[PDB]
Amino acid sequence: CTLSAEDKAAVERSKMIDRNLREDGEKAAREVKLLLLGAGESGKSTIVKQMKITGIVETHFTFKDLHFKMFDVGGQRSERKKWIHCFEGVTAIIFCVALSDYDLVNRMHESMKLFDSICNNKWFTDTSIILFLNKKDLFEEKIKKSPLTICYPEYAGSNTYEEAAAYIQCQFEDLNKRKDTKEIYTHFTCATDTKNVQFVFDAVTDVIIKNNLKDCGLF
Amino acid sequence: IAQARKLVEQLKMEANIDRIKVSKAAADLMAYCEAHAKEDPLLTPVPASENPF
Amino acid sequence: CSCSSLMDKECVYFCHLDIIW
Amino acid sequence: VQLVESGGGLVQPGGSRKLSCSASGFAFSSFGMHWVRQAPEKGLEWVAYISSGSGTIYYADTVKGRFTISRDDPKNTLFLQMTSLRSEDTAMYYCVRSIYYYGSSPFDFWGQGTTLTVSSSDIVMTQATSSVPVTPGESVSISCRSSKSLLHSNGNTYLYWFLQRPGQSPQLLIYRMSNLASGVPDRFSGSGSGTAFTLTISRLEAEDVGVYYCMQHLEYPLTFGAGTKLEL
Amino acid sequence: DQLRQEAEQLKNQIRDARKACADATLSQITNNIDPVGRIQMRTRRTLRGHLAKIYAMHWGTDSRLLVSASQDGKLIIWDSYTTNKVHAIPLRSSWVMTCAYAPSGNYVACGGLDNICSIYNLKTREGNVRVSRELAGHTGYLSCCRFLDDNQIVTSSGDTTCALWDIETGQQTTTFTGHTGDVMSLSLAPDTRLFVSGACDASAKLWDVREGMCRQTFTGHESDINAICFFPNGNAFATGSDDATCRLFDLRADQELMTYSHDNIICGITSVSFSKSGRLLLAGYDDFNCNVWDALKADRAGVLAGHDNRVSCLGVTDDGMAVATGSWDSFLKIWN
Amino acid sequence: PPCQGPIEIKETFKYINTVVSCLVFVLGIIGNSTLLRIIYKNKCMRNGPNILIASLALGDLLHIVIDIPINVYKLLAEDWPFGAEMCKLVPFIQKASVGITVLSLCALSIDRYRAVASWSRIKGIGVPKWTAVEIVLIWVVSVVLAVPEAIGFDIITMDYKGSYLRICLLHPVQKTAFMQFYKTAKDWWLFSFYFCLPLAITAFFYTLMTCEMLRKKSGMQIALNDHLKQRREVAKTVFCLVLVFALCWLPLHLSRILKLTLYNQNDPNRCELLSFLLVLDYIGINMASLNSCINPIALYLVSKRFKNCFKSCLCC
């Protein structure tokens, strides 16, 4: 060609760099990116420990031949949400709120505005959201404290443990403004074994399969 | 007594300014953007021989 | 269409009427 | 950065030998490797070249088809295998690193070399003199000429100025036309045009004496100059 | 109360003195200047290789070398003349929003959500690129790293404050506080003795890098300010906010010079830059495009129509021969 | 020679065939053109399966354009005054389009199987390269397998009850032995390659994909539910897309095999069979064009993204 003997080697180096870039991007596109979100004093240092193991906190783990990267929220202090658009194209959002959230005092306002914010964001409305209620050590002993009229005047009926959980799940379903694209995966388990990892693995498997089907035009 | 004292001190420092007004100060940007216009290859397109792209 | 040969007038007439396939 | 050579010795005509170059101190997998030779008290001569990743391999047309080049990046070793040796293959063999991108120095480091003894178109570089007496403190200008113009269409001039001290290995002084090396005193400079190229030395020091070489890259095969030896 | 009353009355009297002496806006005087026509800029080169969202890009001092930061944790150094990838740096933190080119070409400082500015050395002795120094000390996400010298750089963060560092020691030499929101961008002055920073409190301000005073403040936006950059003569600057408005402020007038908004524009400005002459204010917008405003007339005198995603970063060469635009579509485009 | 009865086609059947062919032709062009516009215009739907679907739509459109008008001309004129060259070329184009369509169906079925069996980043940094070589291979095979149709035909003259006619067809007398074998096994080859093989491949791959989709083993291991019925729905759509293909491509090959089986000679017991075969062949080709049309409708009514794309294109 018209290239000098040195520019040919420069082009060869650039092509080798191209090869390395696509080789590492093949692995980068084969990794599941999970965002982790939650309200104040909701509990995020109890599920990241269950995973198979400053600013942003990154947790890496391989589950069933899938490389999961989870990005935490408890390292930030500014709640201006200027870094959420950096999380576009993530596989899913694990959002964490506890049934004991109205102990730090009210559970409606801040938590439900956080939900509606992540359910109103243009970037996240096409991304599935995973919901967790993990522990079973205090979720029963504070329902029977007193009628919820002090801070929950929307419901004034019979209140057992299962009934309250079902009602909270139903009002969450009411919070979702558009069910056409996004899907909610609520979980009611015991934070005792590796069931959270299996649940998030199944949720990401299903959302990836649905993206595959939409890509094929079958859904 | 001492949380907004620094703010008002800065505002006082924001008062003793050699105040160049927007009609005195628009001339700076005007002169700079007119005097350096001939050497801007984006405002004035470069001849195709000198273009390295 | 397909015929045995030219002596079969009926087959050629069918080929004339039939679709091209 | 350390390139060390091995495999030298005395060999009968018609035999086959192998030279090894082991590197330690830099990114071997990102450097192309050159094999150069110097005839006894005659001058330098390029032998072979292999690009990064073993993609491009070039040989000198003088002994093209007779030698072969092998490389191991995960082991950081460069092999030069010689099949049939005449009475010309006896020489001092050097191993050189060469990285190629915009603004690099592709001949900065040379090896220590090994001795090989055998029992009994191309651009031509012309060096004006071979022995020049001079005393310290006097500016010295060396000149050399080329057949074709080294000036490519990019604007780069492919001229490399090396110095060989007595008992030592060659060291880069200038890599393209006037670009100083790393760790070299800033008194050396280069200038010229097209085919005539001068290396100027101001405030000459005692250890600056030796044999100066100018070579063209520009193309293959690579050719060296005769060698201008400074006297003192 | 006394101190609150004193602050309120000082603010009111400063604003009154500012208004009573201000003559007329920039447009009122510059209306007589003829426009520039339509800046039709064509993609001469498209840089491929980034395989994720591209957030930052900064030109080299020689107007030929580029550094680009993408989401996949890659900082690529490009030769802008032949599309040759000179270097590819695997970053430790994949969440980067800024990084720049050292004025001597030896170093690159780059960072983001890690709250750490990692600085890598290019002209080494081993032929690779190694991490030189990691600057830490911020408690919020990082933005607009800008080298002053080979041992001195200023970085903005979301701690409502900026920091001036010393690379050899690695300790925070100076701290500039006074903002009340996430500070999103800073630009270094050409004289390298002052700078400006805009925050999420809809306010920008001019800070002195030597003695660390809050020299001046600037308001007028309604929402978060995402980008900021000086006029090439270091006597003015421009901000771009989520209000779908760019605003030119002047460092000596003490208020807004003028505005670069349009009715059809609904999305905010995420990147801003100036041409070499300070005549074409280029703004990388949120929808898909980059708008070449005339920094004097606030007219959309050119649109760069590529980039099937939002233009996230802009850059102009020190010689002004080309414009680099990076978007979330994982491509840079070089325009002339 | 007479069969105790002439040969003719009823005018009512001609009108019905004309109306059906016109409707199918218009619907197929509209759907395929809109699908191609959606695939080409949108960059985010530019990828492997979308490229395969675009190739399928292009082949279907070319098939409809090359089939429907010429059959309308044959019905309304019963003459071929246009020469020998394009009667040589048209069967080549027809067989090439049919091969492209069937191979694109097979490749698309394989891709849909892969998306649900190798779901883990099956879309990785895009794969337009392997799809490119696949599409080129498919097109080359389809073109080369239609060249015998591009060599075979010829025009022969005849006199029939005083009428002077010219017919372009596969002449029984040919040069090479292989060409004569092709002339004798034309319909068998068409039925065994353009109908049975794509049907088997698509049905098998789609059955594996459906099995993988509904591969639930642990009873209610997750409380997700709901969209398991959605997977059932899309599987039902998948199996309907195969049933329509089978039922719309069966009659033409059925007519040809009845022609090869029940056609006699030298006795007046063949002419009514030909009269029936005219109508059956025309109906079969019409419903084959309907199958060509059927795909964009299913893509609209199944894929929400495609539904929105079709709504945006048609309503604006």
Side-chain angles (χ1 to χ4, degrees), chain A, chain B, chain C, chain D, chain E, chain F residues 1-42 44-113 115-120 122 124-128 130-182 184-214 218-219 221-228 230-303 305-316:
Chain A
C1 184
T2 308
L3 298 176
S4 66
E6 271 204 282
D7 287 276
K8 307 221 196 73
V11 172
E12 184 172 331
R13 166 187 183 85
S14 170
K15 305 270 189 91
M16 201 146 78
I17 291 171
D18 286 331
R19 185 201 320 297
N20 296 115
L21 279 172
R22 324 181 160 120
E23 181 146 10
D24 64 53
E26 289 208 81
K27 291 313 148 206
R30 204 201 41 61
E31 292 178 352
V32 182
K33 285 174 311 203
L34 298 160
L35 179 52
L36 181 52
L37 272 167
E41 299 299 322
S42 291
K44 277 74 69 177
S45 295
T46 188
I47 296 173
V48 305
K49 307 289 191 176
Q50 188 63 251
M51 302 305 192
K52 180 55 186 58
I53 292 159
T54 186
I56 187 154
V57 178
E58 302 214 20
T59 312
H60 283 109
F61 62 108
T62 182
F63 189 73
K64 304 265 175 50
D65 297 330
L66 269 298
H67 208 93
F68 295 93
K69 319 165 69 180
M70 191 155 68
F71 314 102
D72 303 359
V73 71
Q76 289 296 131
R77 192 171 286 115
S78 79
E79 290 87 6
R80 203 61 181 87
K81 310 303 169 180
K82 299 299 292 293
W83 50 288
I84 45 174
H85 69 68
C86 296
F87 283 102
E88 186 179 2
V90 300
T91 300
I93 312 174
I94 308 174
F95 192 87
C96 280
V97 62
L99 179 140
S100 180
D101 194 66
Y102 54 89
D103 201 357
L104 271 298
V105 303
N106 184 28
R107 183 178 182 270
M108 292 180 183
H109 182 74
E110 53 90 18
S111 292
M112 293 180 183
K113 299 294 187 291
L114 292 175
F115 295 116
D116 204 3
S117 194
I118 75 184
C119 290
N120 170 53
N121 274 272
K122 35 193 171 304
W123 302 294
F124 275 132
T125 314
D126 61 357
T127 62
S128 63
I129 297 169
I130 297 169
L131 270 296
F132 282 158
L133 284 86
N134 51 1
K135 323 181 181 91
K136 203 181 73 175
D137 292 347
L138 202 62
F139 288 2
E140 287 82 3
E141 281 83 6
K142 55 168 311 168
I143 291 177
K144 64 164 65 142
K145 63 161 88 159
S146 168
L148 282 72
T149 316
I150 59 173
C151 81
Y152 202 82
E154 294 287 331
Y155 178 72
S158 180
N159 191 0
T160 71
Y161 163 64
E162 271 86 330
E163 185 72 28
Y167 185 72
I168 290 170
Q169 184 177 182
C170 287
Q171 64 91 16
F172 194 94
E173 196 265 340
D174 189 26
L175 292 172
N176 192 354
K177 296 159 67 71
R178 270 158 289 181
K179 291 86 152 162
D180 291 331
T181 69
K182 180 191 91 178
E183 169 172 15
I184 296 293
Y185 309 78
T186 61
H187 198 37
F188 273 102
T189 187
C190 300
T192 57
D193 198 73
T194 80
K195 292 167 294 263
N196 264 297
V197 187
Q198 303 254 10
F199 190 97
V200 65
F201 156 68
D202 282 340
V204 303
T205 294
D206 195 1
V207 65
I208 290 179
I209 286 171
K210 295 184 170 167
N211 296 115
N212 279 351
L213 294 182
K214 298 178 278 223
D215 189 73
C216 290
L218 202 53
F219 174 72
Chain B
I1 194 67
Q3 53 293 310
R5 196 259 302 173
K6 54 180 182 293
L7 289 156
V8 304
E9 203 265 334
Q10 285 182 350
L11 292 169
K12 278 163 64 179
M13 295 298 102
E14 279 187 14
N16 192 3
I17 305 311
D18 45 355
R19 288 266 164 93
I20 285 181
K21 297 287 100 176
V22 296
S23 169
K24 189 181 179 182
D28 179 89
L29 279 71
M30 291 273 288
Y32 190 86
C33 75
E34 183 178 1
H36 294 72
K38 254 52 191 163
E39 65 183 1
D40 210 341
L42 307 161
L43 172 61
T44 46
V46 70
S49 302
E50 295 266 352
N51 179 18
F53 305 102
Chain C
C1 63
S2 184
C3 282
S4 62
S5 159
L6 271 298
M7 73 291 291
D8 197 17
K9 305 289 179 68
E10 265 68 22
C11 175
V12 183
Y13 184 40
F14 172 86
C15 281
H16 162 233
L17 297 170
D18 199 55
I19 61 175
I20 49 172
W21 164 264
Chain D
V1 178
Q2 199 182 355
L3 290 151
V4 58
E5 283 105 339
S6 65
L10 194 139
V11 73
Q12 296 295 322
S16 307
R17 291 282 287 178
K18 191 170 190 183
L19 306 187
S20 294
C21 182
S22 44
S24 293
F26 64 100
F28 181 82
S29 297
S30 165
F31 273 85
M33 301 286 288
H34 294 231
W35 269 111
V36 178
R37 81 179 163 180
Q38 161 167 354
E41 71 265 353
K42 283 198 279 185
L44 286 166
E45 168 169 0
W46 175 75
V47 166
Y49 154 67
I50 173 163
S51 178
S52 67
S54 298
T56 305
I57 303 182
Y58 285 149
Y59 296 90
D61 46 18
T62 298
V63 176
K64 206 255 178 190
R66 213 169 76 203
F67 290 175
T68 188
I69 286 292
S70 302
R71 194 180 177 172
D72 205 351
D73 286 338
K75 205 162 301 203
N76 301 322
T77 315
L78 170 80
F79 311 96
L80 165 70
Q81 167 72 247
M82 282 155 288
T83 56
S84 64
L85 282 72
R86 285 103 170 83
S87 179
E88 192 66 27
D89 305 81
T90 182
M92 187 66 203
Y93 286 82
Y94 299 131
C95 180
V96 188
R97 66 172 212 179
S98 66
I99 191 166
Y100 298 101
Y101 52 88
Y102 168 69
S104 58
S105 86
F107 266 97
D108 186 74
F109 201 75
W110 288 57
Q112 183 66 41
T114 185
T115 61
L116 176 68
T117 312
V118 178
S119 183
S120 295
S121 63
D122 305 352
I123 303 182
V124 186
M125 295 299 291
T126 73
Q127 285 198 228
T129 61
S130 177
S131 178
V132 169
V134 71
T135 50
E138 318 274 340
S139 310
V140 182
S141 177
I142 300 169
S143 68
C144 82
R145 314 270 192 254
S146 71
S147 301
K148 324 163 161 73
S149 72
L150 295 184
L151 171 59
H152 207 263
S153 294
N154 293 139
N156 291 319
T157 302
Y158 303 81
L159 174 64
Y160 296 67
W161 277 107
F162 306 99
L163 198 159
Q164 173 154 230
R165 282 170 190 98
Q168 301 186 19
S169 61
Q171 303 223 40
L172 188 153
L173 301 203
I174 295 288
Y175 44 94
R176 290 180 178 90
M177 182 56 228
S178 64
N179 290 323
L180 281 153
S182 176
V184 76
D186 51 354
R187 49 175 174 272
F188 300 88
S189 176
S191 61
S193 53
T195 52
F197 310 111
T198 186
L199 183 66
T200 178
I201 300 168
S202 309
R203 278 82 54 87
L204 188 139
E205 187 204 27
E207 61 90 20
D208 298 344
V209 298
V211 191
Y212 292 71
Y213 292 102
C214 79
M215 71 175 258
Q216 63 96 30
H217 194 81
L218 184 63
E219 285 177 6
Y220 283 74
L222 308 157
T223 61
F224 286 88
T228 290
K229 185 212 181 153
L230 283 199
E231 280 285 334
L232 157 68
Chain E
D1 48 355
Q2 179 263 320
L3 59 89
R4 288 304 214 76
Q5 198 97 39
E6 186 196 13
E8 182 74 22
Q9 69 96 27
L10 286 175
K11 288 292 301 168
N12 284 123
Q13 67 87 8
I14 290 302
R15 187 266 183 275
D16 181 35
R18 188 182 314 192
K19 173 65 69 183
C21 302
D23 305 326
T25 68
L26 172 52
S27 78
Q28 185 82 91
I29 294 92
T30 194
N31 181 33
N32 53 349
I33 305 304
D34 47 350
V36 307
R38 207 68 187 182
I39 302 285
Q40 177 49 284
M41 281 175 38
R42 188 205 323 190
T43 300
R44 314 291 171 141
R45 304 281 200 310
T46 287
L47 312 168
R48 293 180 179 90
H50 273 318
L51 296 171
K53 314 182 81 213
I54 293 189
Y55 274 102
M57 170 273 308
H58 204 249
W59 272 98
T61 300
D62 57 327
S63 299
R64 194 191 170 160
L65 272 163
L66 273 164
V67 298
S68 302
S70 177
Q71 183 185 4
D72 48 343
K74 204 72 46 173
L75 175 51
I76 296 181
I77 307 183
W78 310 77
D79 183 13
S80 175
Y81 284 3
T82 76
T83 62
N84 275 87
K85 296 183 171 67
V86 190
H87 287 288
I89 306 168
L91 304 160
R92 284 321 91 211
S93 185
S94 47
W95 309 103
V96 167
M97 305 162 205
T98 186
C99 51
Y101 214 82
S104 68
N106 296 295
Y107 301 104
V108 286
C110 184
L113 299 177
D114 61 345
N115 306 0
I116 295 171
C117 171
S118 299
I119 303 180
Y120 316 85
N121 180 27
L122 314 173
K123 316 292 191 47
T124 80
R125 214 200 150 190
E126 293 179 354
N128 44 39
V129 175
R130 64 150 61 111
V131 190
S132 61
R133 295 298 302 273
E134 311 156 80
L135 308 170
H138 278 296
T139 57
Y141 70 98
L142 202 44
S143 47
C144 289
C145 303
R146 279 304 178 269
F147 282 97
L148 283 156
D149 283 288
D150 318 300
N151 206 47
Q152 184 178 2
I153 175 163
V154 190
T155 62
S156 165
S157 291
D159 306 340
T160 77
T161 182
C162 294
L164 162 70
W165 304 81
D166 195 291
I167 301 299
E168 182 68 26
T169 61
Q171 270 63 79
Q172 205 172 121
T173 287
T174 318
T175 300
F176 321 94
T177 61
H179 266 307
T180 56
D182 273 307
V183 187
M184 290 293 302
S185 56
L186 62 82
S187 167
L188 268 183
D191 291 331
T192 69
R193 277 164 223 127
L194 291 159
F195 68 106
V196 290
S197 65
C200 275
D201 63 358
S203 87
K205 62 179 70 175
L206 159 77
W207 273 335
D208 200 302
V209 75
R210 169 192 290 110
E211 303 274 355
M213 283 74 74
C214 188
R215 282 282 190 101
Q216 282 178 40
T217 61
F218 289 108
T219 57
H221 294 260
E222 88 169 5
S223 168
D224 304 341
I225 294 189
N226 295 317
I228 200 171
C229 82
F230 285 100
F231 197 74
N233 82 14
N235 287 321
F237 63 110
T239 61
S241 65
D242 293 18
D243 191 31
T245 316
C246 279
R247 290 179 204 261
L248 182 66
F249 309 85
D250 190 337
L251 273 195
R252 291 178 314 196
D254 311 314
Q255 77 272 5
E256 159 185 292
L257 277 180
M258 71 156 298
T259 61
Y260 302 90
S261 176
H262 191 254
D263 291 331
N264 189 359
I265 301 299
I266 301 299
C267 60
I269 297 89
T270 187
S271 179
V272 72
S273 181
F274 264 101
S275 62
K276 184 178 184 293
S277 166
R279 189 57 207 271
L280 303 184
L281 170 68
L282 279 78
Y285 274 76
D286 205 12
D287 49 1
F288 290 118
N289 296 341
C290 175
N291 289 319
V292 185
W293 299 87
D294 187 74
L296 277 71
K297 302 196 87 70
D299 293 339
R300 297 172 67 188
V303 167
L304 316 187
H307 286 318
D308 310 319
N309 216 324
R310 65 182 294 275
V311 172
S312 59
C313 55
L314 294 198
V316 182
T317 75
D318 299 62
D319 206 308
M321 185 64 72
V323 179
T325 69
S327 178
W328 290 348
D329 61 350
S330 76
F331 294 122
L332 282 72
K333 291 215 179 54
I334 312 190
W335 311 72
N336 202 149
Chain F
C3 311
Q4 300 295 331
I7 302 299
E8 53 192 45
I9 298 165
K10 309 298 164 52
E11 206 45 59
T12 308
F13 272 9
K14 291 188 186 187
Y15 296 156
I16 298 299
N17 192 359
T18 304
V19 175
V20 167
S21 291
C22 174
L23 297 179
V24 167
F25 169 89
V26 172
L27 286 185
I29 295 171
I30 287 176
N32 290 277
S33 299
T34 312
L35 196 74
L36 281 165
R37 167 185 194 181
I38 286 156
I39 297 169
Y40 160 76
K41 178 177 198 181
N42 294 107
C44 70
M45 283 73 74
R46 194 231 61 61
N47 55 10
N50 289 296
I51 297 285
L52 281 175
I53 284 163
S55 57
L56 181 50
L58 195 148
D60 290 331
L61 191 64
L62 171 64
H63 172 271
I64 282 166
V65 172
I66 207 74
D67 286 349
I68 294 300
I70 200 70
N71 296 122
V72 163
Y73 196 107
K74 292 296 293 295
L75 264 191
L76 298 176
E78 303 196 341
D79 190 12
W80 194 276
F82 284 96
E85 286 76 26
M86 75 184 197
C87 185
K88 181 74 75 176
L89 269 296
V90 163
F92 161 73
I93 300 298
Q94 182 184 38
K95 306 304 180 293
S97 297
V98 164
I100 289 157
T101 290
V102 298
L103 294 177
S104 296
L105 294 174
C106 297
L108 197 49
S109 74
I110 297 169
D111 186 74
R112 314 211 171 161
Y113 157 77
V116 191
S118 183
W119 61 73
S120 171
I122 194 65
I125 74 170
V127 54
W130 270 108
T131 58
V133 61
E134 180 65 27
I135 190 167
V136 182
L137 189 147
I138 277 175
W139 280 50
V140 170
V141 174
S142 307
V143 165
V144 68
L145 287 195
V147 170
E149 279 284 75
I151 309 156
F153 282 9
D154 189 358
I155 294 176
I156 297 89
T157 64
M158 181 155 278
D159 52 352
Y160 190 75
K161 299 192 195 182
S163 66
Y164 185 76
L165 311 175
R166 57 187 178 274
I167 300 97
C168 75
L169 73 165
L170 194 58
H171 184 46
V173 178
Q174 288 162 12
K175 276 308 184 177
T176 80
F178 174 84
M179 202 65 178
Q180 290 173 36
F181 175 72
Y182 181 72
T184 60
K186 175 70 179 297
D187 297 325
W188 278 123
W189 154 255
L190 292 176
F191 170 64
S192 295
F193 197 84
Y194 286 164
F195 181 82
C196 294
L197 187 64
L199 190 149
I201 297 314
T202 55
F204 175 76
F205 273 97
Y206 279 150
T207 300
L208 306 170
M209 181 255 268
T210 295
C211 285
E212 186 60 20
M213 263 163 41
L214 271 73
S218 169
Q221 63 181 357
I222 61 171
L224 195 151
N225 65 78
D226 179 24
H227 295 285
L228 185 62
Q230 174 56 225
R231 288 185 186 179
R232 294 171 111 171
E233 170 180 356
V234 299
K236 279 168 206 179
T237 289
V238 159
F239 264 120
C240 280
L241 280 184
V242 175
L243 187 67
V244 298
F245 169 81
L247 290 172
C248 286
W249 271 107
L250 188 62
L252 184 55
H253 298 289
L254 275 195
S255 65
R256 284 282 199 241
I257 65 169
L258 309 156
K259 184 162 141 283
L260 294 174
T261 312
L262 295 183
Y263 179 97
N264 200 331
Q265 196 180 1
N266 66 49
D267 280 327
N269 202 6
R270 60 198 188 272
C271 274
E272 291 187 359
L273 180 63
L274 302 183
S275 287
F276 182 76
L277 285 174
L278 268 296
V279 172
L280 172 73
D281 268 325
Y282 275 103
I283 286 166
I285 190 167
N286 290 318
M287 81 175 318
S289 182
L290 188 148
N291 175 240
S292 173
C293 177
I294 206 66
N295 193 47
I297 301 173
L299 285 182
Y300 165 89
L301 61 83
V302 166
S303 174
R305 314 171 81 171
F306 266 123
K307 214 192 281 283
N308 290 318
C309 286
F310 281 119
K311 290 279 202 48
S312 62
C313 290
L314 293 183
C315 301
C316 294

